[PDB]
Design a protein around this nucleic acid. Sequence first.
RNA 1: GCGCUCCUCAGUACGAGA
RNA 2: GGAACCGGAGCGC
Length: 149
Amino acid sequence: ATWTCINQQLNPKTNKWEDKRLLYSQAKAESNSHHAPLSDGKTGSSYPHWFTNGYDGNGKLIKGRTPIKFGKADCDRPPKHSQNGMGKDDHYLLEFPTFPDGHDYKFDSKKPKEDPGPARVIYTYPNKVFCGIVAHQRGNQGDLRLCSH
RNA sequence: GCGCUCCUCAGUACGAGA
RNA sequence: GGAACCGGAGCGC
Ligand SMILES: [K+]
Ligand SMILES: [K+]
């Protein structure tokens, strides 16, 4: 499967924010999540960690936010995330950087951590079910949108 | 002693718009 | 997302 993300990137010349299209292999993205450790932000980079998707630890909407629909049960299931995402019955979503070249993000990188880019592979804790690839609408921050495929 | 820089503190406390 | 205080060095005065 091929996923397409649209990311706005600043042009240093025109100084205007321009659209950038980015293609990612799903296999590589899943591979990225398999090789990433299964902890919630306890690496030097802080990745991977909890992707709330608009919810709080008790699986209740946050009000004002609209969760992304991944189209899969385990994924769209409201989260159960404890103080450090290690609850024995915890279940939630993780986000980890993913790129077009598909290389594994150096999760232990720090000061400075490797650039995480705009895209993230989203998957479940603790069975790493693939949910999708999202990407910040503009820059490497702000609103995260579901990409196409 | 005053001003600026870097390391560290620390991906911590704090947090959920990441 | 993400500080500061305390802690150590450099440059200038
Ligand atoms: K400092
Ligand atoms: K200091």
